[PDB]
Amino acid sequence: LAKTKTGEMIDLNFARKVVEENKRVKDNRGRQEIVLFNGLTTSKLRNLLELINHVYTKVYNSDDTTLSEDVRDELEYLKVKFAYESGREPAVRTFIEKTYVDKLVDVVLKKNTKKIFLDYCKYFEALVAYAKFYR
């Protein structure tokens, strides 16, 4: 897929690492209140996943490995949407900055390959799954 800062590998295992690092119990009223990425709820995660899913299925229907200019512009708008969502909610900003998602989509644009985009979608899917599992 790609590499984040300090040369750390980006894999599904690293997705579990990221989701567990920001996973804390923070029990309240004698009841466990699971907190992920400082108040990030599942709904925001699923909205971001669906944002991924659109261009995912668009690339999946495609045959050529090279990302068409339509996919390039879709990923540019994906960056725009990620920035806007991060600005709207502090939890989404924390999730994006911890998960290096925008760096990953920039790398996907740089590679201009179907395989890298699939790997990025799988990493995003992993993050969602792990978050659902630990919640």
Binding site: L49, N53, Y56, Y60, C121, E125
Partner: protein
Amino acid sequence: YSKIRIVGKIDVLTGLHIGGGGETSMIGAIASPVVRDPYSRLPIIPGSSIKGKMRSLLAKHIGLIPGQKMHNQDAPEILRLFGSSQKGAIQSSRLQISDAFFSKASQEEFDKKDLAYTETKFENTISRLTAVANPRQIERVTRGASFDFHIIYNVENINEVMADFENIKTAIHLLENDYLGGGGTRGNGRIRFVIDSIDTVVGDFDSSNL
């Protein structure tokens, strides 16, 4: 011995979902894909799916014996037109319905209008008590897509060709009203059959009246 070739077009009035397994789905993505020709990666209508829907429709139309467990138990016209495997009464199938591939005309038409071949539809099921809904995404063939079929009819008995083609047209009329592939109760699979030409490719039979 004559072989007659019928070639036409199948046009989807509504989105069509004929499924094919063996595909892993990303979370929130197409859970049930459509069957596609591996070569062109284009949607396809399987010959078996058309034959099964047509034979089933025709069998219901003619009638079913009570407690009809087997397909080999069918009307004599169905057994003769679509075949049989009954022990001691192994008949032959005079229909050779084949896979209807994605037409090139419709493919270029879709490429003009910047339309994807398959649409993605959002559905969900809501509990009538808890009012809790579980969502799904289904893949369907975009409406206005065209598939050209190829049905071979073998003339095993010359005298029965008129009756067999009457049954074929009855099945076509039934299948055009009925849906194909995914449930038509949900409105998936509406289709239209337009025949191009009927001609005896092999032999001396006269198919002009057909």
